[PDB]
Amino acid sequence: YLKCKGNQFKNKRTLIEAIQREKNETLKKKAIADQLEAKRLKAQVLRNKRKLKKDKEVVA
Amino acid sequence: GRGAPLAKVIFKRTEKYGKKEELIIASEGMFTGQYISCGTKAPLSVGNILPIGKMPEGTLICNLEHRTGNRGTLVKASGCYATVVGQSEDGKKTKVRLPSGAKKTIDAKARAMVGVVGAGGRIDKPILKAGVAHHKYRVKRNCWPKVRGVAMNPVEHPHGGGNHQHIGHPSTVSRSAPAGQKVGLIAARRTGLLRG
Amino acid sequence: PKQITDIRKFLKISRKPDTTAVIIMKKKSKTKKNTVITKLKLRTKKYLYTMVFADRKKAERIENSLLPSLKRIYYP
Amino acid sequence: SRRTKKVGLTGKYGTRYGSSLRKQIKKIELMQHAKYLCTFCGKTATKRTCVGIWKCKKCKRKVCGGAWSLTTPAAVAAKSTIIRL
Amino acid sequence: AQRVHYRRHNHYNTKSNKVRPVRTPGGKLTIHVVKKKAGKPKCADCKTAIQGVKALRPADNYRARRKNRTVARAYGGSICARCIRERIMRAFLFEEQKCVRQVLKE
RNA sequence: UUAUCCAUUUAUAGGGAUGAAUU
RNA sequence: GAGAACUUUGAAGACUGAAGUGGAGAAGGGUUUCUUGUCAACUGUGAUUGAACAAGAGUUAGCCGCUCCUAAGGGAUAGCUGAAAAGUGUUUAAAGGGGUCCCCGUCUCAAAAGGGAAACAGGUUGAUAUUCCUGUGCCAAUAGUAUUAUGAGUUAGAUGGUAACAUAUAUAUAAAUGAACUCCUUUACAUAGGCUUUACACUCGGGGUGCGUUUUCUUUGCACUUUACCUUUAUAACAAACCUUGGAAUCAAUUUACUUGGAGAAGAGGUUCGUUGAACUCAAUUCAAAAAUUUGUUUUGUAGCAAUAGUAAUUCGUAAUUAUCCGAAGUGGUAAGGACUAUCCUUGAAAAAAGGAGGGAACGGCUUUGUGCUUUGCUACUCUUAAUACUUGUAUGAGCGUACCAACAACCGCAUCAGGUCUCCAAGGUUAACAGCCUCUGGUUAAAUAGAAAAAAGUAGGUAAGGGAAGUCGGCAAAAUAGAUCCGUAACUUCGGGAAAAGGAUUGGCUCUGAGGACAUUAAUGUUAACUCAGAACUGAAACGGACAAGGGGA
RNA sequence: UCUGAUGGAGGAUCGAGUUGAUACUGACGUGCAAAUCGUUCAUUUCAAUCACGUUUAGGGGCGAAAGACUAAUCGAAAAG
Ligand SMILES: [Mg+2]
Ligand SMILES: [Mg+2]
Ligand SMILES: [Mg+2]
Ligand SMILES: [Mg+2]
Ligand SMILES: [Mg+2]
Ligand SMILES: [Mg+2]
Ligand SMILES: [Mg+2]
Ligand SMILES: [Mg+2]
Ligand SMILES: [Mg+2]
Ligand SMILES: [Mg+2]
Ligand SMILES: [Mg+2]
Ligand SMILES: [Mg+2]
Ligand SMILES: [Mg+2]
Ligand SMILES: [Mg+2]
Ligand SMILES: [Mg+2]
Ligand SMILES: [Mg+2]
Ligand SMILES: [Mg+2]
Ligand SMILES: [Mg+2]
Ligand SMILES: [Mg+2]
Ligand SMILES: [Mg+2]
Ligand SMILES: [Mg+2]
Ligand SMILES: [Mg+2]
Ligand SMILES: [Mg+2]
Ligand SMILES: [Mg+2]
Ligand SMILES: [Mg+2]
Ligand SMILES: [Mg+2]
Ligand SMILES: [Mg+2]
Ligand SMILES: [Mg+2]
Ligand SMILES: [Mg+2]
Ligand SMILES: [Mg+2]
Ligand SMILES: [Mg+2]
Ligand SMILES: [Mg+2]
Ligand SMILES: [Mg+2]
Ligand SMILES: [Mg+2]
Ligand SMILES: [Mg+2]
Ligand SMILES: [Mg+2]
Ligand SMILES: [Mg+2]
Ligand SMILES: [Zn+2]
Ligand SMILES: [Zn+2]
């Protein structure tokens, strides 16, 4: 909306192309960030289960 | 016609069931919805109306009576104020300093408003156009523009006539001159640029 | 003028002391043939009241049962 | 783009009246047409309606003030004096 | 095209002599004079338009229906609802504060 | 201070301690 | 007709060109208006004409105005001054009043453009028309008593909704108690800028009817195809404001521009005003389901007014009858409303009149001891609108204007004078254009004269070889330039300008190419517009803002 | 600080009406006219322009100032 108010698109077709390109890129960034966040979260369970595996033995 | 704003203020009748209306020159800071108090025992604050004998030294005042019960005569134009400068030993007298720089002693029971008159500082804008001055005096009185006496004929003015547009006469006249003759600088103690 | 779409109200108006005339208008429809549209109008002191009848049979019944003291006026 | 180097607001006056008078007009009218904080409601929406009357576009209170600005120093000084007492 | 003229006494274009052309069954253009608008009645406190009443010139207001000129509350069609709410709160709470202050004298 | 002059008001309590108010 | 250049009729050729010798009003005039007659003088030539002369006619209002209110102001009353004549106008009036026993507070005139109860369409005369005729409406007023009907309340004054708010449909939405006193609202208001909606106007294509052209062409060129006030008109649609729920940063919503939100935004669901005035299946009509409120369609109606009127046609007779009156869009001239933005040492009337609210005075009726307060029953009485009957002064709608001109010969200027003199309506083509030029509706073809001839001289114009201000006090007068698009613009400067500086190129017609939207079946298909802008080929006696319109530049 | 758009200020700019009157020292000068006619000029959002009503009266009024204007009369109107 603010882009169109600033005289960036002189035509309807150009606006459609621009929004499609932006949509693809903002989908790809999410699709990389979410998978990195999930994979990073997974390794928190091993790190928080080996703690109790050690502490059930030595810490008492 | 006037440069300063007016406050419309409503009091409540005390001898009877009803309401009454007043028009008062507004001091700088007043707002719609404010309660002001008028009387001999009212607290000292901006917009209250008090007798001048209950004000300490240095108080800035406006809308003053030069005689008691007068309903106000002295400090009224926009941006103007007076100063309390002395209280007498036995009461009954109060000394103030007026905007022109004169000093005066007043009855100590006369009334005034605390604060300065609003909308002050309006002679700091250049007028810059003849039409603006046409619109200024359009709502005051018929006194604009002005032809100068050196550009008339002798029948209409003491300065009129001549082959070169001069006065030819000393332009400072005396206090006793008749009505058709008191026309230049009236009873002038002094002429020229001031240097102090 | 005013319009009425309730038959009972129409017959109530006809019997009142200051109804003095009825108008009958017959007119072929603009769509087809054999379509005698009819309007019946009551002249009271204040307003004409108009009721529209699409059925020539029911309409033809209506003004038969209409009280004899009303003057009748035929426009077509 | 920037449409004017110097005269800014006084470009409506053209070439008339001389440069120094236009400078004083510019200084005065910068204050005259600005916005001021309303102390009653918190928004900055107070604008001048006449030579001494100021009004808030949101809460709709009217405050009596200066000619070209909302406060002049001389009134602020006296108010501070009274409040100190 | 067909051209028109004033039918009434006033022949000048004042605010009370406004005009609107109209086509007749006999096939001609004619003039008709237009009534002036009427301001909306306003709240006695905040000077805002009162909801639920009609805006009529006082001649048309005189012969208008009774329910078209009023609302059913403590101040009807003279003070708006926000103002009435604030008035009620002011009354009750200031009386409570005065009564609290009265007892504390001792 | 009573002649004389001025001012104010509906000639409306003798001096000191941004609700509503009438029968 | 005794007598026709300037009386009338028909046929031609032309003008006005909606900023009109077209329509309607004010000031001013006063019968100039209409019908008939008519020529002594007038109508600067004629005249049978005429605003001239003579006889008789013609102006119709509850709804158009005045009459009422107040304005800038005028005249007055008390008092005071002055020989008076006059000047001034609460300056210490025991005044003016209104309210039913009190309070408020001078009188009167001044607006035919300010304020302000109420009306429309068709027809009609030789001369008047929102005034007459026909039909349909509206506004204001309408005593007392009694009866009869319309509805409502109580067995002393009604209800619904959480809320914003809503409710009386009787022939007709007429009734929802309210005193003294008090407070508000309408009447009621400047300028500039763009955006938007709706009516009137204009235009394109279908259907019907009539007319025109027709050696050749032409599914063709023109005309008509209408719908007022009033019914709170019902209901739709829309710019706004407010209510309920909800709970906002990854800030959102949104305009051409803007604007707005924890003092409660978006989303979802509601209430009201304004605009407008049949839009929306709007109203009736069940074919069959859902109630002791639904589907395509029941099919009707220009929603009533309303076709019975108006217009265009075809008829038969010496007032007569029939058929049409209906399908889809575009352009943006004029007027009004809406929500906004901005400007001011400028902030842009009043009164008559009308409405809303606070407060709570008083009060169920009919006879029932007495002196307004003391005694017994019925738990029909209280409002409201309409009609009737009787008593009452005779229980609707006063008085004045209304013909005509408004300059072209009706006015002022000594006149039938090329002068002066206030307001509203406003078609087609070309075009930025209500300019100029040409045209349709309406108006005219008239001017104190005509025919012939055509030299000097004059007045208003048009051209000129070669030179180009040498003419003259002086480039006086006249020429040269000019629209729009694309390029390019100095000194100086108060930095805003100078500037259209100076300068250079292009412009017709015809045949094509490209760019800019909306909508519905799902990116894929389909329908469907308005006007501008940019390129290419071809073409002509090298011409093209072709007429009109339209800067000379510089030191 | 620079670039593109949006936006619509100003006693801004051309210009028809309106209000005026620069040149031809044009016509006319026994006029159409006791101030007209033609062409050419100045002005159009503001100190703008019109209409009615109203106030100011002669040695006085009114004047963005020319001794201008005050009913064809003004360096002191008109009637007796
Ligand atoms: Mg001089
Ligand atoms: Mg002298
Ligand atoms: Mg000099
Ligand atoms: Mg000397
Ligand atoms: Mg209501
Ligand atoms: Mg003649
Ligand atoms: Mg012509
Ligand atoms: Mg011509
Ligand atoms: Mg023209
Ligand atoms: Mg005649
Ligand atoms: Mg005759
Ligand atoms: Mg003659
Ligand atoms: Mg005669
Ligand atoms: Mg009459
Ligand atoms: Mg009238
Ligand atoms: Mg007055
Ligand atoms: Mg009067
Ligand atoms: Mg009027
Ligand atoms: Mg006539
Ligand atoms: Mg008439
Ligand atoms: Mg209709
Ligand atoms: Mg007439
Ligand atoms: Mg005369
Ligand atoms: Mg003559
Ligand atoms: Mg004439
Ligand atoms: Mg010649
Ligand atoms: Mg030649
Ligand atoms: Mg030559
Ligand atoms: Mg020479
Ligand atoms: Mg020589
Ligand atoms: Mg010389
Ligand atoms: Mg020349
Ligand atoms: Mg230059
Ligand atoms: Mg200008
Ligand atoms: Mg000459
Ligand atoms: Mg001339
Ligand atoms: Mg001289
Ligand atoms: Zn505020
Ligand atoms: Zn309110």
UniProtKB/Swiss-Prot annotation, chain D:
The keyword Repeat does not apply. InterPro entries: Ribosomal_eL37/eL43, Ribosomal_eL43, Ribosomal_protein_eL43, Ribosomal_zn-bd. A zinc finger (C4-type) spans 38-59. One of its GO terms (cellular component) is ribonucleoprotein complex. HAMAP family: Ribosomal_eL43. Belongs to the eukaryotic ribosomal protein eL43 family. Component of the ribosome, a large ribonucleoprotein complex responsible for the synthesis of proteins in the cell. The small ribosomal subunit (SSU) binds messenger RNAs (mRNAs) and translates the encoded message by selecting cognate aminoacyl-transfer RNA (tRNA) molecules. The large subunit (LSU) contains the ribosomal catalytic site termed the peptidyl transferase center (PTC), which catalyzes the formation of peptide bonds, thereby polymerizing the amino acids delivered by tRNAs into a polypeptide chain. This is Large ribosomal subunit protein eL43. It comes from Plasmodium falciparum (isolate 3D7). The lineage of its organism: Eukaryota, Sar, Alveolata, Apicomplexa, Aconoidasida. The gene is RPL37A.
